[PDB]
Design a protein that fits this description.
part of a larger assembly, 6 chains, A alpha+beta (about 350), B little secondary structure (about 50), C alpha+beta (about 290), A: about 350 residues, alpha+beta, three-stranded antiparallel sheet, 10 helices, about 25% helix, globular, B: about 50 residues, little secondary structure, about 0% helix, elongated, structural protein, Herpes simplex virus 2
Chain lengths: ~350, ~50, ~290, ~45, ~100, ~300
């Protein structure tokens, strides 16, 4: 509002270069071508009408695409988890007892997935919905290498999610996912990316979750004008660098990646989700997945499956490693800063 | 020693501007102008012989 | 950015309503250009191709989703350019499959079951916008059906998507229409697995690569090699020039059969599932 | 085909005359609505 | 300038400048007075060539693997992971330095 | 803008002779491999001297294998003090129309994807050498993808001859010959292993059904002129039916609930149909002229739209 830092203050208005185009086109000239040669309220609501008028005279800001989806709150909760978390969408679940009957290798139980899903609708009772990311860590908590924070993600979810015996879902939904590895319908064939949290509307058993399906994170209309700011929070069981493990300390934009790992053994199968920050392109990524995840490849003919997640466009990308309190339990949480979401497709690696 | 280089002169052109109505061919035309054509669907002409 | 497709005059009452029926349906235009004729869109311009021919021609042409359809011109917004400019365009389902939220959508020539303008005497075949996980399955089923018709099964005619039953049968035209794919898929495999059979017994050189080979071939590939060579036998064969013509052919079928998405569906204030026949808010830009 | 017949009230007041006279029906395909009448007809009214 | 990243907007200022030394002859001097602490420890850390590459291996894979394992083993230097084929060998990380 | 244009700035050094500074403005739209996606690089981080390993200059086969470790960027504008480039791997421009330049002898068409190759051709290995800095710039050669899938097949197959002619192409009637050159053993074994891991993974139990259909093909090729034009004069399956009489297994393990032919094709596509991408790099760019013509000629700049 007309300050006196006018070297850059005019450039924060979007400028004087708006007249750069407006002068020889609109200010001059007769060309297109010429010839040759009653005490408090109103003004309280009256400035609100003026605020409509201040918004109507003119119509930098990068674009978004917000999505909303009405979501039953059995497996996921937008309530316990704050704005700036990953979410994951799903498909319909009665295709699970059908595709496992034909995609299995010969010599396995094709009736394993058909019974394991009904035991989750009969355990979350004590439909392409949603699974939040933090809920998915505590289910796959029994397969990690940093198991202590895996036992901290499970430490709050049984006490903070809406429902009774969420740990009975955690022990059953992971039993569903351990049946996905056996019945050969892999969970990357089910899990679909859904953007980061900005706002959510609550009701009985259903929630209206709003998220950014594409764009930057830090400037979204979060809804609260007191805090229209949110950062991305990830538990430390999943966050795997490939800058330190490959000694690439050179600066540049880092790419975020969702990665599954598979382990097929006879009734001893595991699930792990990892978010991978790398400076690698997607064409030069699988060679690093060969290096770290070759133990699961020898013991199994896929071993991993990944997809793109977003780009930190900083020349030096910025990470954090803190312990936030979701309810009453401190979980070691990796916080990413300056994150721009762009999704992508999946990949098989037999 | 003393030396130069030099420009000796420079020469533009003049684009000829040709009004269409200067040309004998305008005989074959009957030109009129809608200020709005684009708002028109099929136009017609009636004859009677 | 938006291109125009001029309708030639002389359109009847039902044929002008026929272009009104196809509001948000896909159109391939050859070059992004401001003015463009309606003969270029039409099925006559594709010469006539089979389903291997149309998949080549959907990779050269530039897809545009039709926006508002005026009586004089058809307005088309292209996907590669103006959809990075214009954010969201509506797009109408013609598939029997309901589009869910956030699906990578590809387009497929209409193999299953087509507006013909009688006053103009040209047909407009539109592709069928179904998502990429089905697009890689339905073509792979229809190729695999074509091989069992080259000597079927009780299965393979039925697909389940989103709890709904799909029917590929609903046919003798379809099996001969898709036949030039099948003669390429059979050729690209049988030339492949003989070059493997003619080079692993030719070299089997041990640095560690044969140690990586034969251990991975330990009753997996070498037993598969021996069971092939049991159904086989063990001059100079023109081996090293057959690699080149196969790699140039094998890398070419991967791009026809890729069926890459253009469209992602970020719905907002709407249903998460777009039904068949309805319009879906469609973006291609992040 | 949509060949709407011409508008007699307007053609009652012509903008300008034709000049050459020929058998017109000899070549039709130049036109859209083409009509012959013998000396008079009922639909004109 | 202006560059916008991570949603933040960034300004950068630059200035062009120039240097001419209008003295004819030596116009300035650098005398080195004292010595703070030497950086490199004056150590004994011999070299391996097995970090390096590009020498023809001796012909018996029984022996060529034999030597290397009897040399590279336990050396303060010699490659830990077998040589990555592309960029470089890497020195084992030291637990702590003095 | 940051998502649209993220424009790397190769800084130019201080002392550059006008024979060499005017060489850079002749290189407006060409391709530069940024090692990372910094916003500030140098010419020493771009040039061919940056591309070398320790003492080992890569041959034309191995020089492909470190393009794909870097980020291909088209130069957009060459200022006198720095060179501005747009990396393709992020996003091209706002509206997205950048310009390459054909250094190839091959014309392009609309819709053709553009794969770039090291300078393979004869009379074409053209390196701008900056003698006033000692920096040679191997600008790569952009090609249509039915060429780069063929040339990489010529260079791979020629090295496998050396473990125990081929160097002449044709494109639209133009006989063009690629340089016969020495090839290093470390580069070929990376290519050789990249085949056999991907080919043998593309074999499944369903493939033993398809091998029974080989004498159907020679029975079919002598009738149709299309298969007779499909197989070749110089194929292998024309000889691998007259030595090979296979038979299919009658029963299969759980052979009612599984699909034998369906599992083979997907295992084929994800390992063998993908393989032309694995040895070379991916065509991340295709040509969309607006109004000029269908064909961009050699030496002329070409408008550019990103390619999925």
């Amino acid at each position: 509002t007309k300050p006196l830092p006018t070297a850059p203050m005019a450039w924060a208005e979007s400028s004087p270069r708006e007249l750069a185009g407006h002068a020889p086109l609109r200010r001059v000239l007769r060309p297109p071508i010429a010839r040759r040669d009653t005490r408090a309220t109103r003004d309280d609501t009256e400035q609100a009408v003026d605020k409509i008028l201040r918004g109507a005279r003119r119509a930098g800001a990068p674009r978004y695409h917000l999505t909303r989806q009405v979501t039953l709150t059995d497996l996921c909760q937008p309530n316990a988890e704050r704005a700036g978390a990953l979410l994951l969408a799903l498909r319909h679940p009665t295709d699970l007892p059908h595709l496992a009957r034909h995609r299995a290798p010969p010599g396995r139980q094709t009736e394993r997935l058909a019974e394991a899903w009904g035991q989750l609708l009969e355990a979350s009772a004590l439909r392409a919905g949603l699974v939040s990311f933090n809920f998915l860590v505590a289910a796959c908590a029994a397969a990690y290498d940093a198991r202590d924070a895996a036992e901290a993600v499970r430490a709050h979810i049984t006490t903070n999610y809406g429902g009774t015996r969420a740990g009975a879902r955690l022990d059953r939904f992971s039993e569903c996912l351990r049946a996905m590895v056996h019945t050969h319908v892999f969970p990357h064939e089910v899990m679909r990316f859904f953007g980061g949290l900005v706002s959510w509307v609550t009701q009985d058993e259903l929630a209206s979750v709003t998220a950014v399906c594409s764009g930057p994170q830090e400037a979204t209309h979060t809804g609260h004008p007191g805090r229209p700011r949110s950062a991305v929070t990830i538990p430390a069981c999943a966050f795997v660098d490939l800058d330190a493990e490959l000694c690439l300390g050179g600066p540049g934009a880092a790419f975020l990646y969702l990665v599954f790992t598979y382990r097929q053994c006879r009734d001893q199968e595991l699930c792990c989700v990892y978010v991978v920050k790398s400076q690698l392109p997607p064409r030069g990524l699988e060679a690093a997945l060969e290096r770290l995840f070759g133990r699961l490849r020898i013991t199994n003919c896929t071993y991993a499956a990944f997809a793109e997640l977003g780009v930190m466009p900083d020349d030096s990308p910025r990470c954090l490693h803190r312990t936030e309190r979701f309810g009453a339990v401190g979980v070691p949480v990796v916080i990413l800063e300056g994150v721009v979401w762009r999704p992508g497709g999946w990949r098989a690696c037999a | 020693d003393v030396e130069f280089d030099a420009l000796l002169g420079s020469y533009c052109n003049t684009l000829s501007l040709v009004r269409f109505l200067e040309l004998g061919l305008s005989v074959a035309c009957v030109c009129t102008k809608f200020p709005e054509l684009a708002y028109m669907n099929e136009g017609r002409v009636q004859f009677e012989v | 950015f938006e291109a125009d497709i001029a309708i030639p005059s002389g359109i009847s009452r039902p044929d002008a309503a026929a272009l009104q029926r196809c509001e948000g349906r896909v159109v391939f235009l050859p070059t992004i250009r401001r003015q463009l004729a309606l003969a270029d869109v039409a099925h006559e311009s594709f010469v006539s191709p089979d389903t291997l021919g149309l998949l080549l021609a959907y990779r050269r042409r530039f897809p545009a989703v039709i926006t508002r359809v005026l009586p004089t011109r058809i307005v088309a917004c292209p996907v590669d350019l103006g959809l990075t400019h214009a954010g969201t365009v509506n797009l109408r389902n013609t598939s029997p499959v309901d589009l869910c939220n956030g699906d990578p959508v590809s387009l497929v020539p209409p193999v299953f079951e087509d507006v013909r303008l009688e006053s103009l005497d040209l047909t407009l075949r539109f592709p069928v916008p179904l998502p990429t996980p089905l697009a890689r399955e339905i073509v792979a089923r229809l190729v695999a059906r074509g091989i069992r018709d080259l000597n079927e099964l009780p299965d393979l005619n039925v697909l389940y998507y989103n709890g709904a039953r799909l029917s590929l049968v609903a046919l003798a035209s379809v099996n001969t229409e898709l036949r030039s794919l099948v003669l390429n898929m059979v050729y690209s495999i049988t030339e492949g697995t003989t070059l493997i059979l003619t080079l692993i017994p030719r070299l089997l050189a041990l640095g560690y690569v044969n140690a990586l080979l034969q251990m991975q071939s330990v009753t997996r590939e070498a037993a598969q090699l021996i069971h092939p060579e049991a159904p086989m036998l063990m001059r100079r064969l023109p081996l090293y020039e057959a690699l080149v013509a196969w790699l140039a052919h094998a890398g070419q079928l991967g791009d026809i059969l890729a069926l890459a998405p253009a469209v992602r569906v970020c719905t907002f204030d709407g249903a998460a599932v777009v039904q068949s026949g309805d319009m879906a808010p469609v973006i291609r830009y992040p | 085909r949509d060949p709407p017949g011409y508008r007699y009230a307007a053609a009652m007041v012509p903008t300008g005359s034709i000049l050459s006279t020929i058998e017109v029906a000899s070549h039709r395909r130049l036109f859209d609505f083409f009509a012959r009448v013998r000396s008079d007809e009922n639909s004109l009214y | 300038a202006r560059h916008e990243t991570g949603g933040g907007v960034n300004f950068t200022l630059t200035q062009p400048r120039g240097n001419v030394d209008l003295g004819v002859g030596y116009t300035a001097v650098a005398a080195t007075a004292t010595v703070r602490n030497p950086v490199t420890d004056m150590g004994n850390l011999p070299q391996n060539f097995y970090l390096g590459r590009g020498a023809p291996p001796l012909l018996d894979n029984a022996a060529a693997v034999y030597l290397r394992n009897a040399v590279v083993a336990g050396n303060r230097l010699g490659p830990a992971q077998p040589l990555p084929v592309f960029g470089c060998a890497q020195v084992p990380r030291r637990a702590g330095m003095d």
